[PDB]
Every structure is written in structure tokens, then in C-alpha cells.
Amino acid sequence: GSSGSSGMPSRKFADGEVVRGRWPGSSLYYEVEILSHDSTSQLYTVKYKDGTELELKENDIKSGPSSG
């Protein structure tokens, strides 16, 4: 009822946050970091351990339980 969006636009993922991304072709979720987020095509730019940058949809990217 006219409630929810207030303050700043919460993004499914934050900058730097370490989430699991599904590499294109491998169909497997790997530990990747959040670099940027493109709204145009909802493509998120994450980085892999092997210094690799790719564009994964908001859905392709998934996160788990926080630890620390």
C-alpha cells in the first residue's frame, strides 16, 4: 500500500560484494565479485579469480549465507 521504495534504490547486490555468478557456457556458479551493474540490459559486471570480467543478468547472479 504505497510503501517500499523510500530513500535509496536498493540493488540486489552491492559493489565489491562477493556473490556466486553463473559463467556463460559452464552453467556453473562460481565465486565472483561485483564490479558494476548495467540497467540497460540488467547485465552485471563481475570479476573472476582468474581476472576475468563478464556480464551476468541479475538472475544469473546468486548469493548465499553471510559469514564473518
CATH code at 4? 2.30.30.140
In the chain, DSSP assigns E strands to 18-22, 29-38, 43-47, 53-57, 61-62
Cβ atoms within 10 Å of 61's Cβ, excluding its own: 20
Number of structural domains in the chain: 1
Longest Cα pair distance anywhere in the chain, in angstroms?
46
Please identify which residue in the block is written with the cell numbers 541479475: 58
Give the H or E element holding residue 24: none
Range of the domain at 25: 1-68
Please identify which residue in the block is written with the cell numbers 558494476: 36
Q: String of b and e for 32-51 (b: at least 16 CB within 10 Å)?
A: bbbeebeeeeebbebeeeee
Cβ atoms within 10 Å of 56's Cβ, excluding its own: 21
3-state SS class at 62: strand
- Cβ-based neighbours of 59, under 8 Å, separated by 6 or more: none
Per DSSP, 15 falls in state S
